[PDB]
Symmetry: C6
Subunit: 90 residues, 6 copies
Amino acid sequence: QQEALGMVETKGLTAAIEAADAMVASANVMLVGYEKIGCGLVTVIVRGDVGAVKAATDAGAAAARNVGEVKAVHVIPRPHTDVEKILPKG
Amino acid sequence: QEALGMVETKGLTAAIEAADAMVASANVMLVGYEKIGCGLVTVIVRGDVGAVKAATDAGAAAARNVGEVKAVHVIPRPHTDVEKILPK
Amino acid sequence: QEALGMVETKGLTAAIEAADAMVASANVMLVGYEKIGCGLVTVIVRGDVGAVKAATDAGAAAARNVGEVKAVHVIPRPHTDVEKILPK
Amino acid sequence: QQEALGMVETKGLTAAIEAADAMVASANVMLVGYEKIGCGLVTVIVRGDVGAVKAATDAGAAAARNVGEVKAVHVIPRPHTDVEKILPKG
Amino acid sequence: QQEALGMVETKGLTAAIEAADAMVASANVMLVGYEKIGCGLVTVIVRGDVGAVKAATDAGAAAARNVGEVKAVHVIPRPHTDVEKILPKG
Amino acid sequence: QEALGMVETKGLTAAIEAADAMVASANVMLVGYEKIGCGLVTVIVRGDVGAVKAATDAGAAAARNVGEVKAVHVIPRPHTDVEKILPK
């Protein structure tokens, strides 16, 4: 019953924006937000159906890797508290 | 009895994976995140000593597949009350 | 048609030079700056695809004489509305 | 007449929290606070009787060194303006 | 009709303050402000007549280089939108 | 006559030791601290040129036993009024 969670972390904001844009191409994936965490790292987070999020994060990481470095790509299909409990800030 | 668990990662994504696993792996409450620079993020949980011990281990393990884990530690009973010592 | 342009620099001064040149070099609106740590600064502009393409090229070029350029990129049409995807 | 001042600086928050916890074991030592200063550095600060603070900072640094790196341990026995003048924020 | 824009970027705040002080020696140069951008980098910005700003930034960089590292010195003689449009915060 | 003194350290603790010593070592007022990233902290004092000169020397010396000192400098008379040039 929980939406899935998708992350793409990049070094560089531009890569993260490219990532985000690509991830939201598919209209069933909502962009939760960015998170700066220092030393140029930016984490783009998206919510949605497991398969969509899977496809989106892959698409996002792919888009991003042509613009700057990609430090992580990960999907959490069934978050264990509410998405909001486990996230810090949209 | 009641305790504090930490997993510190380089990368937010690793920390989120850590957090999710820690909640999944035992009856522990997720206190929260803390950014401290250069991509380091500290996930913190409260709960029963054994649960927290199991959760932090599970969290660090999950996390290590996503990014780097810089620390894993449990404080089995904090010397001011369990959250007094946290800054958050 | 309508688009997004980015020039990321190490150094604020390089980013300001970049911004100034981007505005000079075509009919493009300067959205703004974003600091993301360790001296990295991302200048962002909106406008017509070709203008933004020309501006980002001009901006990166200007900037490279002042400090390091870490990225130059154009998103010719952003998939939420042009500013929806930006955090600023 | 001034309380003494104790510092333990660590790379890593977890080390600093361990440090703080250990330092406050002794009920005559008050924890002033944490200070993040970048690149993972965190400074734990405590106030109290000179001897207590001496003992606490030593205990804290010790606790901490098993969890992450310790970058400084220092005691200022008699601060020269008020503790509050010389500190930035609790 | 636009004022010119002068920048001196330093690693170290002390260098930047020395830079700023030197730049404002000449009464026809207004100090816009500082900007921290991470990893010890600080950007001092000044506004004024093209020649003054030219002279000031040179003087500032010079002063600064004896105190810490100078990462950039640059003058934009005729900013293309208003100075305020192209700047982030005084 | 009236002046500005700076000691920049890597580490807050070194900066606090520096500050304490600077106040101890002469008739100088402590303006304040400034964090600027990667553990760098700049302690600033105002006062009589000679006092500030003596204090900054004393401060840097104290500090060097605790952590790294990145800069020591005195501006004997600031060209806008003594605090105008500071950002704090």
